[PDB]
C-alpha cells in the first residue's frame, strides 16, 4: 500500500542522521521524544553513539521514565551489554558515587535520588544484572538510613525487599539472611509506632531464598505467612511473585493440589495485567513449567518453557542471565521429555546455550553456573550411552564427570555439605559412575545420596523415590545385590504410586528393572504378574494422555484474588 511515514518518525530519522552535531540538544528533549531518538539510534545499529549516552545516569533516567516502552529499553540495554560496553556496571557505579554526595543534603533531593535508584535498580533487576543492581539498592539503603522518619522506614524496608531479590538471583544466600534480618528489624521498628508495613513481598522473597537454599519446609512456612499477608491493595507484581514462590514451595512439598491453583492464578494474573510478552509473565510461565515438570506433565511442560524462552529471548536479547535460566530450564525439561527417545539434539543445544551465556556474564565460581553444567552433563552422558562409538562414549563420560565435579564443588562451597542439592549432585554422580562402568563408587554415591535425602526430606518423597530407583537399578543390573534391589524397587513403586498415582511416568523404568530382576532370580508367576502390571501401566499411559495445552488450562479465571489465597490458607489445617 506504501503508506507515507509519520512526520514524527520522519523527523526522528532526520535528527538521528544529524546526531553528530545535534547530540547536546537531544538530551534536552521531552522524554518520549528522547527515548525514540535513542531507539532509532539502536535500530540503525549505531550502538557506540547509543552506548555513550546510556552510560550516564542523568540521560538513562529520562529514558527509564518511559514505562510503556521499557520492553524496547530492555532490548536496547541488552544489545549494549552484548556490544561490549558495561552499561550496567557504569550506571550502578555512577549512582553509587552520586548518592553519597547528596546523602548529607536535604530530604527532598534524597527522596528524588531514592526514586531514581528504585527505578534504576528495578530496571537492572528486571534485566538480570543482580550484581549491578545490588550496588544501586545498597546505595538507596544508605540514603534510607540517615534520617529517622516513617517514610524513610518505608523506603528502607522496600530497599531491603528489593535487595533480597537481587541477592537471591545472584546466589548470594549468606547475605540474604542478613538482609532479611535487617528488613525485619526495620519492619519491627515501623510497627512499633503503630504503622504496620505489608510483608507479602518480603516473606515471598524469603521463601524464594529458602527454596533456593533447599530448606523446603521453612520455605513452605514462609510462603504460608506471605499468603497470609496478601491484601487487596498490593501491586500485581508483588501478588504474582508471592503466588509463584508459594506454588514453587508447595510443589516441592508434594502438595500438588494447592500449587496447581496457586500457579494457575499466578499465570492468569501475569497474562492479564502485564501481557503475553512481558518478562514477569515469562517468569510466571517458567515457574508454571517448573510445577508441570514436578507434577509429571512433561509434554506440556516443555511447551511452557519454550513459551517462557520465546518471551525472554524476544525481550532480553541474546546473552542474558534470564535467557540463560530459560535455556537451562528448557534444556532439562527437553532432556526429561526425550529420555525415552534419545533425541538429545535440541536439549543439548539449549544446555550449551545456557553455559555459553553464563560464562560470558558470570564468574566461573558462581553457583548459578553450576546448575547449567548439571543440565549439560545429564544430557551428554545420555548421548554417550546412545552413541555407537566407544572413544566418544568415554570422552562424554569424562566431560560429564568434570561438569558434575565442578557443580558439586560449587554447591558444597556455597550451600554447605548436607542439603538437598548436594545430595542431588551425589545421585547424579552415582548415575554417572553406573554409566562409567565403575559401580563400586556408584554404590557409595547412591548410599550417601539416600542418607542425605532421607535424613533431611521425608522417606516418601519424589527425590527419595528417584534415588532409590537409581540405586536399585545399579544393584539389579550390575552390582547384583538382588534383595536390596527388590526392596528398593518396591519402595520406589510404592512412593510413586502414592505421589502421582499409577499414571506416573517414572514407574516404567522401575517395572522394567523389576521384571529383569525376577527373570534373573525366578518366580515366573510374579514375572507374569509384573508383566501384566506393566501392560496396565501402559494402558493407563496411553489413556487420558491426549490433554490440552497447559496454557489453555489457564483461561479467564472463575476464581479471583482473595479466593485462591483464601482456599490455600484455609486448607493448611
Amino acid at each position: 500500500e506504501w503508506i507515507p511515514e509519520t512526520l514524527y518518525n520522519t523527523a526522528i530519522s532526520a535528527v538521528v542522521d544529524n546526531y553528530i552535531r545535534s547530540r547536546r540538544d537531544i538530551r534536552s528533549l521531552p522524554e518520549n521524544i528522547q527515548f525514540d531518538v535513542y531507539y532509532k539510534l539502536y535500530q540503525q545499529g549505531r550502538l557506540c553513539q547509543l552506548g555513550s549516552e546510556f552510560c550516564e545516569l542523568e540521560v538513562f533516567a529520562k529514558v527509564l521514565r518511559a514505562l510503556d516502552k521499557r520492553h524496547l529499553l530492555h532490548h536496547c540495554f541488552q544489545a549494549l551489554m552484548d556490544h561490549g560496553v558495561k552499561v550496567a556496571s557504569v550506571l550502578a557505579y555512577s549512582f553509587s558515587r552520586r548518592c553519597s554526595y547528596i546523602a548529607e543534603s536535604d530530604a527532598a533531593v534524597k527522596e528524588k535520588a531514592i526514586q531514581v535508584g528504585f527505578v534504576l535498580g528495578g530496571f537492572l533487576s528486571d534485566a538480570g544484572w543482580y550484581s549491578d543492581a545490588e550496588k544501586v539498592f545498597l546505595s538507596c539503603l544508605q540514603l534510607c538510613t540517615l534520617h529517622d522518619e516513617m517514610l524513610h522506614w518505608f523506603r528502607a524496608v522496600e530497599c531491603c525487599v528489593r535487595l533480597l531479590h537481587v541477592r537471591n538471583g545472584n546466589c548470594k544466600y549468606h547475605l540474604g539472611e542478613e538482609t532479611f534480618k535487617l528488613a525485619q528489624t526495620y519492619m519491627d521498628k515501623l510497627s512499633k509506632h503503630g504503622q504496620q508495613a505489608n510483608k507479602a513481598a518480603l516473606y515471598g522473597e524469603l521463601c524464594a531464598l529458602l527454596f533456593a537454599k533447599s530448606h523446603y519446609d521453612e520455605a513452605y512456612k514462609w510462603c504460608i505467612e506471605a499468603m497470609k499477608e496478601i491484601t487487596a491493595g498490593l501491586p500485581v507484581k508483588v501478588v504474582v511473585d508471592v503466588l509463584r514462590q508459594a506454588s514453587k514451595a508447595c510443589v516441592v512439598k508434594r502438595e500438588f493440589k494447592k500449587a496447581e491453583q496457586l500457579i494457575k492464578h499466578a499465570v492468569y494474573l501475569a497474562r492479564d495485567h502485564f501481557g503475553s510478552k512481558h518478562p514477569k509473565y515469562s517468569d510466571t510461565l517458567l515457574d508454571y513449567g517448573f510445577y508441570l515438570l514436578n507434577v509429571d506433565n512433561i509434554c506440556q511442560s516443555v511447551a511452557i518453557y519454550q513459551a517462557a524462552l520465546d518471551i525472554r529471548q524476544s525481550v532480553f536479547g541474546g546473552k542474558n542471565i534470564h535467557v540463560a535460566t530459560a535455556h537451562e530450564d528448557l534444556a532439562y525439561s527437553s532432556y526429561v521429555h526425550q529420555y525415552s527417545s534419545g533425541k538429545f539434539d535440541n536439549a543439548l543445544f539449549h544446555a550449551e546455550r545456557a553455559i555459553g551465556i553464563i560464562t560470558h556474564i558470570l564468574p566461573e565460581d558462581h553457583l548459578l553456573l553450576a546448575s547449567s553444567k548439571r543440565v549439560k552433563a545429564l544430557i551428554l552422558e545420555e548421548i554417550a550411552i546412545d552413541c555407537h562409538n566407544k572413544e566418544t562414549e568415554q570422552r562424554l563420560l569424562q566431560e560429564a564427570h568434570d561438569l558434575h565435579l565442578s557443580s558439586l564443588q560449587l554447591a558444597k562451597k556455597a550451600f554447605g555439605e548436607f542439603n538437598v542439592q548436594t545430595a542431588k549432585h551425589y545421585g547424579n554422580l552415582g548415575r554417572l559412575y553406573q554409566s562409567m562402568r565403575k559401580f563400586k563408587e556408584a554404590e557409595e554415591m547412591h548410599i550417601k545420596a539416600i542418607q542425605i535425602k532421607e535424613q533431611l526430606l521425608g522417606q516418601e518423597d519424589y527425590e527419595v523415590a528417584l534415588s532409590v530407583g537409581h540405586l536399585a537399578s545399579l544393584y539389579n543390573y550390575d552390582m547384583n545385590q538382588y534383595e536390596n534391589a527388590e526392596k528398593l524397587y518396591l519402595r520406589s513403586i510404592a512412593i510413586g504410586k502414592k505421589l502421582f498415582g499409577e499414571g506416573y511416568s517414572g514407574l516404567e523404568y522401575d517395572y522394567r528393572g523389576l521384571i529383569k530382576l525376577y527373570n534373573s532370580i525366578g518366580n515366573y508367576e510374579k514375572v507374569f504378574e509384573y508383566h501384566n502390571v506393566l501392560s496396565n501401566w501402559n494402558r493407563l499411559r496411553d489413556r487420558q494422555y491426549s490433554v490440552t495445552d497447559a496454557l489453555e488450562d489457564v483461561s479467564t479465571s472463575p476464581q479471583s484474588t482473595e479466593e485462591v489465597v483464601q482456599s490455600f490458607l484455609i486448607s493448611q489445617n
Partner: peptide, 9 residues
Amino acid sequence: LTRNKGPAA
C-alpha cells in the same frame, strides 16, 4: 532404559 531420569536441573 537402565535406570530412571535425572534429578533436577
